[PDB]
Swiss-Prot record:
Shown part of the complete sequence: 371 to 593 of 603
GO MF, one example: magnesium ion binding
Gene: PLK1
The protein's name in its UniProt record: Serine/threonine-protein kinase PLK1
Disease: Defects in PLK1 are associated with some cancers, such as gastric, thyroid or B-cell lymphomas. Expression is cancer increased in tumor tissues with a poor prognosis, suggesting a role in malignant transformations and carcinogenesis.
GO biological process: centrosome cycle; double-strand break repair; double-strand break repair via alternative nonhomologous end joining; establishment of mitotic spindle orientation; establishment of protein localization; female meiosis chromosome segregation; G2/M transition of mitotic cell cycle; Golgi inheritance
Leader peptide range in chain numbering: none
Domain POLO box: 41-119, 132-214
Function, in words: Serine/threonine-protein kinase that performs several important functions throughout M phase of the cell cycle, including the regulation of centrosome maturation and spindle assembly, the removal of cohesins from chromosome arms, the inactivation of anaphase-promoting complex/cyclosome (APC/C) inhibitors, and the regulation of mitotic exit and cytokinesis. Polo-like kinase proteins act by binding and phosphorylating proteins that are already phosphorylated on a specific motif recognized by the POLO box domains.
Effect the entry attributes to changing V46A: Loss of centrosomal localization and of S-phase progression
Induction remarks: By growth-stimulating agents.
Amino acid sequence: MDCHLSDMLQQLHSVNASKPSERGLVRQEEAEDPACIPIFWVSKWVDYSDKYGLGYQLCDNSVGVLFNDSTRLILYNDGDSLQYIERDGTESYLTVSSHPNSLMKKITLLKYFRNYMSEHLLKAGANITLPYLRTWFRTRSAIILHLSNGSVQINFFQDHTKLILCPLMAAVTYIDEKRDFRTYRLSLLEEYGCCKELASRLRYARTMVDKLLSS
């Protein structure tokens, strides 16, 4: 279909329409649901899309690059197994250790990205406890990352806050300015309400989802 985007749009429409912050008394912590904790999110990213591509690390320590030719290469957390996605969407598997002629340049570039992120970038959470990047864009406000499992992650530039939206769980994970990781069931945010900050980012998220659907 559309990689679960329509599902996430309906869930976001529903939570926002419930106006969860426009109430005098609110119990946000009641909407927290430990059954909805996500398995995957983007822990690091580097935009070198002008000439090279968008590199990223997932929370399991795997690394991926979305190249400018619309292919993607993923190096698993074992540091050897590769997953290659052609523009078709066609997936193949190989190893760094087999030294494949076909992908020598792409593996080399991926390693540049991996080397940059490990020594220079801070993990998004990492104090807590295989999909690829399907598409991404940035606004002046945020980078939007749409993973192949339907998750949409939005990293806001100004305060480093983050939303991780999973449509299968109908849940949202919010990483605050204090890098604390909280997971809410969206239907519970409707029921119990929430603070103005979260409600506002969920409003922005719906706009970003509409954008992903519009393109």
